[PDB]
Structure 1
Amino acid sequence: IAEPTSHDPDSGGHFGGPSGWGGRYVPEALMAVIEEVTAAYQKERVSQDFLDDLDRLQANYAGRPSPLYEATRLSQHAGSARIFLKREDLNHTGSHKINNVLGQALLARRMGKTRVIAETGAGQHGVATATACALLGLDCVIYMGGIDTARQALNVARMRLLGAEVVAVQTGSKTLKDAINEAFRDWVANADNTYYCFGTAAGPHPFPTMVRDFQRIIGMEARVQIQGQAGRLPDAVVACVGGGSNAIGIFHAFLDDPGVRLVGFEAAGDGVETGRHAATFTAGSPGAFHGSFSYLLQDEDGQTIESHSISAGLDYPGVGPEHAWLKEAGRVDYRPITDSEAMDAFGLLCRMEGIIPAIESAHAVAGALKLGVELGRGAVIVVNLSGRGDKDVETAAKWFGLLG
C-alpha cells in the first residue's frame, strides 16, 4: 500500500501548530508553481501507478534494497557496541539522493515540465538529477557554489557527461546556501516550464514532506533488516544532518518505537566555539530561511551566518523544519561532530571495513562511535551510510598524507 499521514504537517505545511515550523516563506511570484507541485504531489502520492513506476526504477535501476552490514571490526572503537551500516553508498550514483530524485523526476514528467533545475553542494544531488534527467529526456541545469566545484570536481565532470549544464555560483559564501539562492532566482524567472528538483528535506511546503516521503524507504527497509539480523529493534538510529533528507528518511520508520533513540549529527567544522562550523541546532536559533521557518545560524540582526565544513554536503547554515519539530518535541537528539572527528572515522572505516564513506557519512560514523561508548557493550546502533567517498578521495588523500 501507500504510507500513513500521522507525522505530516497541515495543509499549509506547518509542523506542530498552525504557526509553527515549516510553512511557505516565499514570494508571491512562486506561489502558482508551488501550488501546482503541491496539487500534483497530493494526486500522485496515492496513485498505485506512480508508486509502481517509482518502485520499478528503485529496484531494477538503482539497486534497492540496499544491504545492512554489521561492521564488526568497528565494535572496539564504539565501547563494544554493534554498528550496523545502512549501505546507501551502494545506490546508483553513490548516495541516497537518487531516492528523492527518482520520485521528483517522475513527478516532473507527470506535470509536463520539460526543464529541471537543481542545486548541489557535494555534487551528489546534482549528479543524481542529471542522471534522472538523462534517463527521462529532460533538460537539466545544476547550480553549484564555486568553492564546491573545486573540492568536489569529480562530480562536476560527471554532471557534464550526463548532459547537464553546470553553473558555478560566485555570490556569497560560494557554497551550498548560495547555490540555492541562485536556483531560486532561476525558478522565479522560469516558473512556467521548469521543475525545481530540491535535494533535501527543507524549503517551502511541500518539499520537506515530499523529500521525506521519497527517502522513507531507507528506514522502512532498515527497520525490517535490523530485526532479521539482530533479532530486535535497535537501541539507536543515527545519521548525519545537513538539510536533513537522509536523516529523516531513515528516522521515520522508527518514530513510533519508544525504545529507539534517534541521534542526528551535524557538521561542527573547526569547532562550535571557533565561529567556523555548521552546527545549526547547537549554535543556531529559529528563523525564516530558504522558504521555511526552522533553525539557522544567524547574527543578532537576522543575517545568515556563513557556514564552514570540510564536508560540502553539510556546509549549510540551516536545517529542515521537520527536524526542528522533532528537536523541540524531544524525539530526536542533535549533536555536533567536528572535521577532525569525522576524518578519524573516515580513515577508520577504510582501515577496518574496506568502505570508503562520503565525508558527510563519516560524521555519522564518528557520532556512532561516541554513542556506542555511552550505550556500551551489546547495544545495537544502526548508522545510515549515506554515500561513498569517491568524490572525497582527493580531499581525504591530502588529509592523510598520501599526496604532499
Structure 2
Amino acid sequence: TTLLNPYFGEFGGMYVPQILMPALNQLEEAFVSAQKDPEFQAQFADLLKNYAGRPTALTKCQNITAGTRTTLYLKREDLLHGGAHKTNQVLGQALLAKRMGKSEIIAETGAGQHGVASALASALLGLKCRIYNVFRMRLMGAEVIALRDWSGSYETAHYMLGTAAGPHPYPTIVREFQRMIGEETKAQILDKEGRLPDAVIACVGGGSNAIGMFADFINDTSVGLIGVEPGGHGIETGEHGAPLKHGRVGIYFGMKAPMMQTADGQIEESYSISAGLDFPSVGPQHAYLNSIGRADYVSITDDEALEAFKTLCRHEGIIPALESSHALAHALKMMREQPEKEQLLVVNLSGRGDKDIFTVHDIL
C-alpha cells in the first residue's frame, strides 16, 4: 500500500528487505506532503535560485553547427553550483530530510560527484553527513568512511540516493527535484525560437539528469526524447554501460529494471571512459518510456565522446564533462549524418569537464 504508483509499466517497485519498508513509506508520505506545501516549494526555489544559481543559461552553439541546417542549444547545468545537475536533487532531498525532523545524511559515491554534492548540501543546511573529491567532502565536514546503516537509523537519518533509480519513491522524487531543468529549457527555447525543440538529448548513467530534462516534455508528443548510454569500447566488445538497450531485466538495488548481468544472474560491471556513467542499471521510468516508444535510447563510445569533448572546447570555449560529452556526441552525429536536415536540438550539458582535464590528457 502506497500513495503513489511504485511502477512504470513493469519496471520499478520496492524490492528491499521488509525492515526497510517503513523508511520508504515514510519518505513517500513526507514527499507527497512537501509537494503540496507552498512553504516547501518557496524554500526549495530560494536555495536553487540564490544558492545554486538557477535558472541556468541556454546557450546556442553557432560555430559547431556552421554549414548545416541544425540549430543546437546547450542547457547549462555545468554552470550550476558544484558544476553538475546533481546539486538540484540533493538540495531537495536535504530539505525533505529536515522536513522529516532528521539531522543526519547517509550517502555513497564512486567518483565523488554525488558525495561532494551531498556534503555541500549538508554543510549548508546543518546536517551531519556520512559518506561511503575525498578532500572536498572532508573540507565540507562530510565524514568519509549504506542501506544497512539506514536500516537501523532511518528515524534520525535520511539516505540520499544519487540517481533516478532504486526503490520507490526515489525514482519519482529524483525526477521531480530535477524537472526544473526541462521546465526552464522549455521556457527558454520558446523565448528564443518561438517553438518547442525537435529533440532533447541527455546522457543516461542512472537517468537523473536525463529524466530531469525529459519530464516536462513527455506530454509534448512532437518533442523527441533521446537518452544516450555509454558504449565504452564498443557494444560488441561487451565492455560498455548500456543496460537499457543491451542488458537484461532483473531485480537489483530495490528495483526491477534493465541490468547488466551474467547469464547466471550475477550483476556485472558497466565500463565507460566516464566514471559518472558506471551505473550497471538504469532508472525504471526510462525503461518504461523506451518500452512504449516515447523515448529513444542510443549509445556513444569513448572515442566519440572524447571527440565531442574536444570539439566543444575549440568551437565554443566550453569544457563539458565526459558524461555530457556522450550526449553532445550523439547530437553531432544527428547533424553530421544529415547536414541538410532542418532540426532544432537541445543537449543537456549535465556538467563541466574540468574534472576530466587529466583523464582526457592521458588518453592524448
TM-score tier after normalising by the smaller chain length: over 0.9
For residue 100 of structure 2, what is the aligned residue in structure 1?
A: 111
For residue 4 of structure 1, what is the aligned residue in structure 2?
A: none
For residue 359 of structure 2, what is the aligned residue in structure 1?
A: 395
For residue 160 of structure 1, what is the aligned residue in structure 2?
A: 138
How many residues align structurally?
Answer: 362
For residue 195 of structure 1, what is the aligned residue in structure 2?
A: 158
Q: 1:338-365 CA distances to partner (integer Å, 9 max, x unpaired)? A: 1111011011111111111111001111
**Letter in structure 1 aligned against 2:16:** V
TM-score normalised according to structure 1 size: 0.87
Indicate which of 239, 243, 246 corresponds to 1:276: 239
Question: Secondary structure, in 3 states, of the residue corresponding to 2:144?
Answer: strand
For residue 222 of structure 2, what is the aligned residue in structure 1?
A: 259
Give the Å deviation of 1:374. 4.8
Q: Say whether residues 1:380 and 2:358 are aligned partners.
A: no
Alignment of 1:61-76 (within 5 A): 61-76=51-66
Distance 1:186 1:365 in 2: 39
For residue 350 of structure 1, what is the aligned residue in structure 2?
A: 313
**Where does the alignment leave 5 or more consecutive residues of structure 1 unmatched?**
1-8, 144-154, 168-182
Identity among equivalent positions (%) equals 54
Give the Å deviation of 1:72. 1.0
Q: Say whether residues 1:21 and 2:19 are aligned partners.
A: no
Q: Say whether residues 1:50 and 2:40 are aligned partners.
A: yes
Q: Is the 8 A contact 1:129 1:140 kept in 2?
A: yes
For residue 258 of structure 2, what is the aligned residue in structure 1?
A: 295
Distance 1:276 1:128 in 2: 29
Indicate which of 294, 297, 304 corresponds to 1:334: 297
Q: 1:9-46 CA distances to partner (integer Å, 9 max, x unpaired)? A: 97340113xxx211100001111111111111111111
Q: Is the 8 A contact 2:320 2:351 kept in 1?
A: yes
For residue 268 of structure 2, what is the aligned residue in structure 1?
A: 305
Distance 1:237 1:166 in 2: 36
Q: Is the 8 A contact 2:3 2:28 kept in 1?
A: no
Indicate which of 110, 134, 154 corresponds to 2:123: 134
Q: Is the 8 A contact 2:203 2:324 kept in 1?
A: yes
**Letter in structure 1 aligned against 2:7:** H
Q: Is the 8 A contact 1:101 1:132 kept in 2?
A: yes
Distance 2:302 2:168 in 1: 32
Distance 1:353 1:30 in 2: 48
Indicate which of 212, 233, 246 corresponds to 2:175: 212
TM-score normalised according to structure 2 size: 0.96
Distance 1:332 1:56 in 2: 32
Distance 2:66 2:3 in 1: 45
Give RMSD over aligned pairs.
1.5
Q: Is the 8 A contact 2:3 2:29 kept in 1?
A: no
Alignment of 1:231-250 (within 5 A): 231-250=194-213
Indicate which of 21, 37, 62 corresponds to 1:31: 21
**Where does the alignment leave 5 or more consecutive residues of structure 2 unmatched?**
none
Question: Secondary structure, in 3 states, of the residue corresponding to 2:101?
Answer: coil
Q: Say whether residues 1:365 and 2:355 are aligned partners.
A: no
Q: Say whether residues 1:96 and 2:85 are aligned partners.
A: yes
